[PDB]
Amino acid sequence: EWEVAREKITMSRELGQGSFGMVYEGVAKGVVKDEPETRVAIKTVNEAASMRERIEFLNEASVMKEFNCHHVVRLLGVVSQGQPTLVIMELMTRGDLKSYLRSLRPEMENNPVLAPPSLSKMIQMAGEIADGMAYLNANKFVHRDLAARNCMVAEDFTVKIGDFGMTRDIYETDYYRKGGKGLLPVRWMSPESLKDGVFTTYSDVWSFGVVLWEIATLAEQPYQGLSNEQVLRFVMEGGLLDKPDNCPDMLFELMRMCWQYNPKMRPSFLEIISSIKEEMEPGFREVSFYYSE
Numbered sequence: 030e031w032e033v034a035r036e037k038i039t040m041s042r043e044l045g046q047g048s049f050g051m052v053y054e055g056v057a058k059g060v061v062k063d064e065p066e067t068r069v070a071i072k073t074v075n076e077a078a079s080m081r082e083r084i085e086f087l088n089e090a091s092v093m094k095e096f097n098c099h100h101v102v103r104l105l106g107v108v109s110q111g112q113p114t115l116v117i118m119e120l121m122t123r124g125d126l127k128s129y130l131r132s133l134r135p136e137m138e139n140n141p142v143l144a145p146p147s148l149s150k151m152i153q154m155a156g157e158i159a160d161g162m163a164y165l166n167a168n169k170f171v172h173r174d175l176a177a178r179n180c181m182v183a184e185d186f187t188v189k190i191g192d193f194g195m196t197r198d199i200y201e202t203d204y205y206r207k208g209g210k211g212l213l214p215v216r217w218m219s220p221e222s223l224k225d226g227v228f229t230t231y232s233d234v235w236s237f238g239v240v241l242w243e244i245a246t247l248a249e250q251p252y253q254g255l256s257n258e259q260v261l262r263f264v265m266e267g268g269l270l271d272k273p274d275n276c277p278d279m280l281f282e283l284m285r286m287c288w289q290y291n292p293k294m295r296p297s298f299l300e301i302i303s304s305i306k307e308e309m310e311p312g313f314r315e316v317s318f319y320y321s322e
């Protein structure tokens with residue numbers, strides 16, 4: 030079904046170190062309808078892994094087999110015969126959103142443009158990110174690590190929901206062992222998740238508000254001036270991120286709606302999209318989950 034000729038897959042270079050194995054970048058022969066070749070991201074499984082691990086790999090991959098959204102990085106077949114287990118996916122040529130935002134900084138430094146930022150561009154990303162998340166939540170899937178570093182940028186600048194899931198030494202401090210038991214993205218977590226360690230769609234929305242803050246600051250780390258333990262106390266007691274410098278008032282208002290203390294009072298991704306859909310580009314209606322059937 031999704032199994033594909035491993036011979037029809039040629040790895041080029043490396044993108045990063047995955048959990049089950051190194052992640053490469055290459056091309057696939059006939060993996061997309063009406064397409065000869067296709068740039069893709071190759072996910073592998075180090076031979077130094079038993080079946081207890083190998084099977085787990087194809088377990089989480091079968092989860093994506095049910096996903097089909099313009100705003101979520103799509104799966105493209107899988108390999109697991111007479112060679113190392115592999116999984117193929119749509120390749121996002123501009124990388125993750127945090128790196129992309131960060132790479133814009135130098136330009137903006139020596140760029141002779143003293144004009145406010147484009148609210149229009151930020152809304153496009155917001156809606157694409159919110160549309161991909163609405164789709165995921167609709168399929169009873171909670172992300173648990175929504176952050177700019179886990180959003181991907183396409184060649185055409187479209188943003189899609191993914192999960193970097195690779196080494197990344199530059200974002201290691203984005204995680205903290207709240208209680209030893211695993212690395213958690215504490216600066217992106219809601220008050221309730223910081224307490225019981227439970228993630229829901231309500232908390233994905235809180236994280237969404239933080240991603241909007243990341244976009245407006247060109248990915249500065251949330252809660253400047255506070256250590257991890259200080260962030261914990263501050264957020265759990267009702268503290269909130271500050272309005273970014275030169276942030277369109279409308280964007281911050283959206284953020285604040287995402288950061289209400291009472292989880293049940295936060296709007297859902299569908300409500301978020303409904304309140305900004307009239308600001309979305311024309312094409313949005315064509316390929317978005319929101320307008321779909």
Ligand SMILES: C[C@H]1C(=O)N(c2ccc(S(=O)(=O)C(F)(F)F)cc2)C(=O)N1Cc1ccnc2ccccc12
Nearest residue numbers: 070093101102119120121124125190191192193194
């Ligand atoms: C590691 C690889 C991967 O498997 N996923 C991924 C996609 C969808 C889902 S999902 O559907 O379960 C959900 F979205 F719901 F999480 C989960 C994970 C990425 O985003 N990756 C990074 C990546 C891909 C493609 N191109 C890249 C280019 C640069 C860096 C990293 C790139």
